[PDB]
Amino acid sequence: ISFRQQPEENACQFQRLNAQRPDNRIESEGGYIETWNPNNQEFECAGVALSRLVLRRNALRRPFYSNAPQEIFIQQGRGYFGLIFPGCPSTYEEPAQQQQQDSHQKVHRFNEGDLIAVPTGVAFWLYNDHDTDVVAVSLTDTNNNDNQLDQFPRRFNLAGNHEQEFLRYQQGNIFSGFTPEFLAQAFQVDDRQIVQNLRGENESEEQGAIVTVRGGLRILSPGIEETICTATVKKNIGRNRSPDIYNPQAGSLKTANELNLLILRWLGLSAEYGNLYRNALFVPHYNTNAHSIIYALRGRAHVQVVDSNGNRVYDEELQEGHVLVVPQNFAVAGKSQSDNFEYVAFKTDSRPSIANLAGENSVIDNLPEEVVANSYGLPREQARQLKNNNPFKFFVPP
Amino acid sequence: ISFRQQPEENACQFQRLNAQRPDNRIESEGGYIETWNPNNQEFECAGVALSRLVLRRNALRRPFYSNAPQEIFIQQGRGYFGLIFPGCPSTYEEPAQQQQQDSHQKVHRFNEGDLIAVPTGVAFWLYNDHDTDVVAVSLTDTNNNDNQLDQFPRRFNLAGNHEQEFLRYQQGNIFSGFTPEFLAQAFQVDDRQIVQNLRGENESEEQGAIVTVRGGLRILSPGIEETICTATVKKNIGRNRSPDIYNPQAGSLKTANELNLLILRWLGLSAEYGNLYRNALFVPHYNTNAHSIIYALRGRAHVQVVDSNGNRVYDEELQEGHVLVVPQNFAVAGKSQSDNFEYVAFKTDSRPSIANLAGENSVIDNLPEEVVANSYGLPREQARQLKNNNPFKFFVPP
Amino acid sequence: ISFRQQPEENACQFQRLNAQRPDNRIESEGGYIETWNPNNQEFECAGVALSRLVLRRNALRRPFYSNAPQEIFIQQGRGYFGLIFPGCPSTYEEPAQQQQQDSHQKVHRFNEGDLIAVPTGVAFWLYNDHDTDVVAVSLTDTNNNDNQLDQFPRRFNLAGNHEQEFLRYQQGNIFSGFTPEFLAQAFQVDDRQIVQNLRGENESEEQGAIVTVRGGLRILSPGIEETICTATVKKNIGRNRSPDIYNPQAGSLKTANELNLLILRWLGLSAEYGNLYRNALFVPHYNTNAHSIIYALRGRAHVQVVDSNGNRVYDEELQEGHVLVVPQNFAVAGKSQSDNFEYVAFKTDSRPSIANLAGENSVIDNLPEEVVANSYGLPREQARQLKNNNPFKFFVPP
Amino acid sequence: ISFRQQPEENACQFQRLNAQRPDNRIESEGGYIETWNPNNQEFECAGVALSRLVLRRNALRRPFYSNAPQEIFIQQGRGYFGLIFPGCPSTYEEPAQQQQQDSHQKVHRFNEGDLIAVPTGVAFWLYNDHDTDVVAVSLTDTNNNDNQLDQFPRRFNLAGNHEQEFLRYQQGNIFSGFTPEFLAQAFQVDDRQIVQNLRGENESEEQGAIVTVRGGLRILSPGIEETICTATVKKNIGRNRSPDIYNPQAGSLKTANELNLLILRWLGLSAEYGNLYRNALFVPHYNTNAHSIIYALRGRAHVQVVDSNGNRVYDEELQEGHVLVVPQNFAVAGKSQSDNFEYVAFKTDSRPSIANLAGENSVIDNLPEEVVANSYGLPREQARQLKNNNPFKFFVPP
Amino acid sequence: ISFRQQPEENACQFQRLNAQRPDNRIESEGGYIETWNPNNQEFECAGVALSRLVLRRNALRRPFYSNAPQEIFIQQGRGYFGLIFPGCPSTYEEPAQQQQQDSHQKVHRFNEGDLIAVPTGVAFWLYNDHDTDVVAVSLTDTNNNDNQLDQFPRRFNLAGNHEQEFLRYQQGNIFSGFTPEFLAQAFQVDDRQIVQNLRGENESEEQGAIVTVRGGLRILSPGIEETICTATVKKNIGRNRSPDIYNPQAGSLKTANELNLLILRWLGLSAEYGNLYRNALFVPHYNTNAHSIIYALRGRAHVQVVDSNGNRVYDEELQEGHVLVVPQNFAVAGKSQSDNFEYVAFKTDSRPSIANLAGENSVIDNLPEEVVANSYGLPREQARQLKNNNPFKFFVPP
Numbered sequence A, B, C, D, E: 001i002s003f004r005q006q007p008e009e010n011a012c013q014f015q016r017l018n019a020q021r022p023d024n025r026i027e028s029e030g031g032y033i034e035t036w037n038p039n040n041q042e043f044e045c046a047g048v049a050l051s052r053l054v055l056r057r058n059a060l061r062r063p064f065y066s067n068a069p070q071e072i073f074i075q076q077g078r079g080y081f082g083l084i085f086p087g088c089p090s091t092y093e094e095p096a097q098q099q100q101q102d103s104h105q106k107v108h109r110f111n112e113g114d115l116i117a118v119p120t121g122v123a124f125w126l127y128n129d130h131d132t133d134v135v136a137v138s139l140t141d142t143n144n145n146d147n148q149l150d151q152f153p154r155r156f157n158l159a160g161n162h163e164q165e166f167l168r169y170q171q172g173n174i175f176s177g178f179t180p181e182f183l184a185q186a187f188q189v190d191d192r193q194i195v196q197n198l199r200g201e202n203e204s205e206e207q208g209a210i211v212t213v214r215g216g217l218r219i220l221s222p223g224i225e226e227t228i229c230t231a232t233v234k235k236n237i238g239r240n241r242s243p244d245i246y247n248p249q250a251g252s253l254k255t256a257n258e259l260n261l262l263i264l265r266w267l268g269l270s271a272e273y274g275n276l277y278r279n280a281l282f283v284p285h286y287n288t289n290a291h292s293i294i295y296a297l298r299g300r301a302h303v304q305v306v307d308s309n310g311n312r313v314y315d316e317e318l319q320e321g322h323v324l325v326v327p328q329n330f331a332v333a334g335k336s337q338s339d340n341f342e343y344v345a346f347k348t349d350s351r352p353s354i355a356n357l358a359g360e361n362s363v364i365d366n367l368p369e370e371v372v373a374n375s376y377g378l379p380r381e382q383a384r385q386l387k388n389n390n391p392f393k394f395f396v397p398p
């Protein structure tokens, strides 16, 4: 399911669909954030915004929450993240060096291939504790029903004194806007310099969203607390040894949707990770109920996309680090021109449905032979060939 | 329930409501499609598009899917249709002249009075195998949540090389946009002329959406396959020997909603079929939770519609083949000027609720006598008359 | 949950947030209705309209229904109201002075502190039978999914011949628009002067929505009828001896949401009533999933609101009878400058979720100590103070 | 809805139905508990157990939880109760005489007429702070799906050293069963006499479930905390100024079901409170989907109950403090022989449905006249009398 | 949630609770199956049966389905399993050495710590491809609503000619019961020796449920197909780097319930994996809504269990490979007497709720101080100690 705002008149009427690369980079201390322009037609149509975060060893992306739900895919690396679900008690705690030292909400490990769901207004932070840079691609669903503000994807930063991620595309931290007397009362701290730091007064716009932790972070990691407050918030789909669709001579597909990661039901979002081997084809298909935002992860594939007029709105080699939006119901097909073309496709429904146009149990396969024969002007025998020559589903070997 | 986009500022503020007739006809080989202009205020307000299809004996409306959910009402005729639900296995099959000849998804018979639900992105085809022309009136819900593209009702045609139904009102087939090398791989057909026909290369813009089948079509007709893949997709309401509301001296009403046809729950749509006998009245009423799109089927009725200012925005004889949109909450009443005025009313909710203003259990009937007396400046006795003189619900005899 | 239309581009981007007072008063016989301009940025952002009704002893607000769901809070007074749920049989009846005198739908008592839910298209009337004026503050959710007309909050009046509440802000009664011959047939009344009064012909635009009942109203008050037709439609939250959050030295909070008043689930709305004692603080917090429309009921409080840029968009004393909209996710904090500051806060979700930024189980409390230390540049000890110095939730004593 | 275990073979086959009075009293310090024998046929059939608690001024019924869901009706008196929902944070707190003194879960006020829902395993305590004795009648649903133990209604007492309520009918406190070394570690109390008292070692079997608090109790009373952790758990139905069905010359009915008190949906239980005035009749009716456990509150009524053989299994004056079980689908009718007969009827469904056999919209009223005429051997005119002579619903005046 | 049959009268009334070890072993070719007697009081009470499977390198547990839902926990080892969901198309396929070689349903990898959900009537097979023996502990929910046969847990074996697992405890394969002429027609195999083998005719009762695959198995592994047919059926909880509750000085807990593994919602089952370090305590607690079936995985713990009479029904060292049933609502506490006591606890609800009796946010912590003081006969100060001395949740360090 999904419940989203429709795009403005004509947004999904295309002369041509363009693949997109980021157009801005925001520098910080231990990494950076790159943004795709959400004002481009492809993104206006899909009603979403996209960004990419790089976190070096010991870098902390300091906590923030957003008005629009997010899905974050971990392209590379491993580390820790927390989500703060409001009012949920702490369940991670340690004895002083019995009295209590520190306690906090569950800290999660993440790995390459993980897809993480961040509900609207839930605070998120991410940390890399390893050499390999973490690279995360974040889809922010601006048109989602859950966003009751206008279609600007905001980051409400809990810390720092820097530029909002997507501010440059529109026509300080959250604490920094409150007066010192409110914050001293709120936190019962008399130390006016505790409140100064809280407000970000002891830093420039160039410390950024991401800080490096000298010596590394130490955090705890090996009724309502073990039920709703500890619901699952991520699922591995990129590294998984169990794809949903698999042909060892053509490729694989694996989805994280609301049947795999229940919280996606509330978000109205899902994602798929696919592999397509050299010269293999993902058959013409369309998504009945979702836009697809395809981020090329590795390699390259010749991709074609067809609109409701049968126009070829996109025809080229989709390369690593570029993004192609395939609007709901537009048909798409791809032939990998790499040993293994790899991609993540975010989708704007929690249970997206693929309709294959060719192959076993495809639309053509499921029409009566005489209907295929009469629709295409074909003798009964050539119609039977169209229905039966390809015995495979989804992927076709070289 | 329904989840739809609201109309633009002022769309439902009317100086006058106009009844509408089609304004375009698209010719094909065995029939035609007529469209109502969806840009007219009445349709902008309702957020929907309407069309009418005529299929002569042996005519096939070749498969297509759409971005917006549809409800199709069979005004006359009988025939076969298929819906292709993606990935559902074939369940209709026959032995070669044991090995398998052809197999395909369930083929359904349709009859006059049938209301058929077509979910977003589900492919549909229709065939008439009888002398009587089939006439189908199709409501396309452009503002529906399920449509994540802009508010243009598209037809993604699987076959042919013709004009999109509603294209003329905006500011080739799906295969025709793919290169021949993609389609040969996708269908494993080496015959480049199989792929030519598939793409519609062997036909003009004037073969159209509808083809005639010489000698007639032959199709099969007497776990997940007998459960979800064979869910009901139509319900008879026009020919039914069991209306929901009935008075043999005034008229009848029968609804297909989500309690009768479960799939309507996902579509957010329903329809009603009514009869009103000469000089009988359907009392002033309004729909709490839906627009009503009234297509006159037979005869004529004097209809009045009142807006939130108590203005009479419509006051005339609604005739057969004209359409009147009654916006949500506007009050409407009708007096049949024909032996039997017959109408289908599509509604933009899966469970629309009628609030009668006069008659048994109406709004007036359910207010305390002293409230009716004090609201209208009436003596207790004249208030009692207003509540009680009409003992009938919905319809009132001549 | 809620399903609402998003506001236009930039609506929730504020240079400053203004508190608002009503800007129009509509006079009637036994009371008046005051409206806030819904075109002001604060209301455009929230997608809602607000009004205030005053009903003197024996005054009847004559029946009406609206396209948008309402929540009405009873600030003062007591009286009777009815809601007319269409087609539900009468369940209140009396013997003639056995035959039946009058019968009607359930009449409800209301009291100060009551929050009443009025679904879209359900007719409502209100009566005051006591000396104390009734004062009701009404939130109309114009952007709600249930409103399938444009974003004008309409009142479809069943009686009278006066001005629609919100008409002055856009770019007769319902019966008055029908011809006398339709109404005589509909109600089977031959008396053409019964129909004249019904249409409001025997009154000026200056009798208004509210009439005085001379001698007072007499009404009855001590399967589907005792189940769905008598579902609960109100909950006391202002006068309640059982707040949800309570600290006798700082304040209280009490909510009516879909867990307390089930019908709110369909409306997508809820409300909260809070008390804050002199010099006590409601800590910086935000609502994850709702706009807050704060109506000051008694006293005054210094309030600050911070946007996604950390800008202080509102900083002043919120006074009784003024309204402050806090957009979804914006942070807000308040310090009462009165013996008891009292407020109702309507919220645009049926289950709104508050995320406290300071105090026990707040966002800061639930982050690892080393994350708070590294986010704010603080030694481990000053981080521990930020997490632990305030042991209270929500409210902090003077 | 409800999900319950069916009774053993023949349990609901009755020679006669007997009204029942309690058969045991358990004495304590400030009040007592009386139990009805759950082994009697009437209770075996209904699959439930019943008890009655009396709490004098300053008496505390010390905390306990049970394996079966309960509904408690407050027949008289007023006081405080708490329910402990596991893991929910405290939301009632006070400053030490800023640091925190005590904090605890919400304390609720209760009043006469309140119906309180206690889910399976949720701990409950009750306190009377007024002169008038509190009298509470408790229905324990032993056959409920939520009880996964055998059909013995247990009380797991958190305190005391006394007899389990229903133990005498089968074929120490919870802490008392743990060894002192477990409890010292669990509560980190070194004081072995703290643990002695906890275990109930400093008291006899004759301090009982109920203790008197000398000087009276002092308690606090004027994200997940204000949402799920503060869901409503009671609804007034006995004292309510708004019955669901009302005739000032015959009686009233008011229900607390899952549309009024949402938590009842999980419990599978509901209750009704009725008044019937001298010589008035509640018409023959049956409950489609629930047993009815009728506790007479005040006065007396001649009651008759008819089984599936048309046998009169009960025919007598039901008196105050007696209980009559009416099995699902058995027909029942009553004529009050008191100025006002008052009763609470617990029902074993969360949304019980009454089917009236006589009167407006009854079963007879809703059958075609010719069906009533042919079913009873009656001329058309006598059939019309049977359908129409009684114009009232539910109750009929003297 | 769960919907289960209640146990017979007195089943959960215990003189003493006994830990249980298996009492039977069924030998096969590459491993064995051990069963616990389901007729023992502990299992009668819980309404469940338990077994343990060992599969050596290259051993295949041949396909079977059961009348009762199962949860299988992988104690050690790694391998492949399939579940056959009826009518779901194949999604794993390979090209002949383009035509199709073999195709089949998704084959899943499993690892140590995995919890696998097997719905009623879904066929399951398991294979070990590694040196380490796989050991799986299987809970079969005999009293589950989904089992509409009597309370005998059956295995309907698709292959083999051996003893049913639990047959010895009651008062050939599925094909073997059909006549050869039915099977030849059903599979269109003329070879009467193909059908002989299918029926298990070419093997003794001593080939067993488990076969060894010489040279090892080769299987494929790297619309409705990628949605419902590929829903998740397992979740790792034993090996997971992210417990729900964690204290590095006492222990951890991690649950797989319906918020983590959605299919458990239909099964009415869940499981927890816990670690408890030497001399640490899991505080007295109870489960509100589930039986707990505790299988000791490693080490030993002193465990005590208390019934509704405060009787200590179990008091001893629970050792590895023994099982202890803790009935719903009975209180339990454990102190590890090993470096790391490890256990899996199956629970008879899809969302079981733990109610802690001591510690932060426990039942005692959430009662008003004066209620704890008056319930236990304690001065205000000793009551405060009981509420506050243990600042930890669930686990308490040595």
Ligand code: NA
Residues within 6 Å of the ligand: A012, A013, A014, A307, A308, A309, B154
């Ligand atoms: Na298009």
Ligand code: NA
Residues within 6 Å of the ligand: B012, B013, B014, B307, B308, B309, C154
């Ligand atoms: Na209007």
Ligand code: NA
Residues within 6 Å of the ligand: A154, C012, C013, C014, C307, C308, C309
């Ligand atoms: Na902002």
Ligand code: NA
Residues within 6 Å of the ligand: D012, D013, D014, D307, D308, D309
């Ligand atoms: Na009987």
Ligand code: NA
Residues within 6 Å of the ligand: D154, E012, E013, E014, E307, E308, E309
């Ligand atoms: Na017991």
